[PDB]
Amino acid sequence: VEVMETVPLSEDTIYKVEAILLPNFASGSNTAVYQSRGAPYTFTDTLDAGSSLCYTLAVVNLPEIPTLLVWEAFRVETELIFTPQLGSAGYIRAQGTPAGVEGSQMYFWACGGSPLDVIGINPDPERMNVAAGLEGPSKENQPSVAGIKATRKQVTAANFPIEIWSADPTRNENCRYFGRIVGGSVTPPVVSFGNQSTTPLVDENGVGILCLFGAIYLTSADMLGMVGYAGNPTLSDAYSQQRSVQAAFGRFFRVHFRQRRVK
């Protein structure tokens, strides 16, 4: 598509979308399950549906506009919704203190004119399996790296686990995304939030996200760590059967649009 000039700003040529994407521990491709804590995360060699956080997706329809004019997203405000977890996450008997949330984390958002492109990799393919309800890589004896043989798909269903699928920097042409992954078994999360920040979506030529299909595609995943059961001990072998993934309560998006002429 050839990109031409923006349409002069006025009440009729601007738009905004607000959404909260909810944490998703899907059971299957067409069954997102919205809950902020997973089912207990078992220590088996298999990634299980219900305990493994998946990307959340939202496709938000934009108004029809009467060469062609399309909506162009030029900035986004995005913020996580969360509260501090003390006793809600159980307690550490050995330290006589609330456990809180801690562990490995992922903070991720994307805004695009089409679905998020991802690469699916099994990190320990001699040993690790992906349950039938979740999208896993193809079984083609490919190595555990992001090469030409790696499985590539788009996030168009509820069951893409974040422990398998990474954003594909070789695609995602008409999309902006940002991610941060933190390792460690007990690492503290840090969640900053407010209502004053905004992120531009325009490239070096001043071009934002062109909504050529008349919708905006929002994708997110926000894992903050692991937690136990409220009122119970945790962070011990004895209570390993109750340890669960904690996600944020939601990721807010406010996307701002103008109109762009394209050919």
From the list 30, 192, 205, 263, which residue makes contact with a second copy (rule: CB under 8 A)? 192
141: left (phi over 0), alpha (psi -120 to 50) or beta: left
Residue type, 180: R
- Encoded one letter per residue, x for contact with a second copy by CB under 8 A and - for no contact, window 53-72 reads --------------------
Among 71, 229, 255, 259, binds a second copy (CB under 8 A): 229
Residue type, 93: R
Nearer to a second copy, 61 or 198 (CB): 198
- State which of residues 70, 157, 158, 223 lies at the interface with a second copy (CB under 8 A): 223
Q: Is 191 in the site for a second copy (CB under 8 A)?
A: yes
> Which residues, listed in sequence order, are joined to residue 29 by a DSSP beta bridge?
none
| Minimal distance, residue 158 CB to a second copy, in Å | 14
Residues 6+ apart with CB under 8 A from 190: none
- What does the binding site for Na ion look like in residue numbers (CB under 5 A)? 42, 44, 46, 48, 61-62, 214
Among 2, 10, 11, 43, binds a second copy (CB under 8 A): 43
Stretch that binds a second copy, among 5-13, 104-112, 131-139, 210-218 (CB under 8 A): 104-112
From residue 158, how far is each of 54, 99, 227 by CA, in Å? Answer: 7, 30, 23
Distance CA 100, CA 225 (A): 9
Q: In the bound complex, what is the minimum distance in angstroms from residue 89's beta carbon to Na ion? A: 13
Task: Give the tokens for residue 256.
Answer: 């701002």
**Closest C-alpha to 181, from 112, 107, 244, 249:** 107
DSSP 51: T
| Residue 262 near residue 19 (C-beta atoms within 8 A) | no
Nearer to a second copy, 106 or 216 (CB): 106
- Biggest alpha carbon distance in the chain? 68
Considering only 6, 13, 27, 144, the residue that binds a second copy (CB under 8 A) is: 144
Residue from the set 225, 255, 257, 259 that interacts with a second copy by CB under 8 A: 225
Taking CB under 8 A as the rule, does residue 257 contact a second copy? no
Min CB(216)–a second copy separation in Å: 17
Taking the C-alpha atoms of residue 177 and residue 108, their distance in angstroms, rounded to an integer, is 7
Query: Which amino acid, 216?
Result: I
Of 245, 257, 259, 260, the residue at the interface with a second copy (CB under 8 A) is 245
160 touches a second copy (CB under 8 A) = no
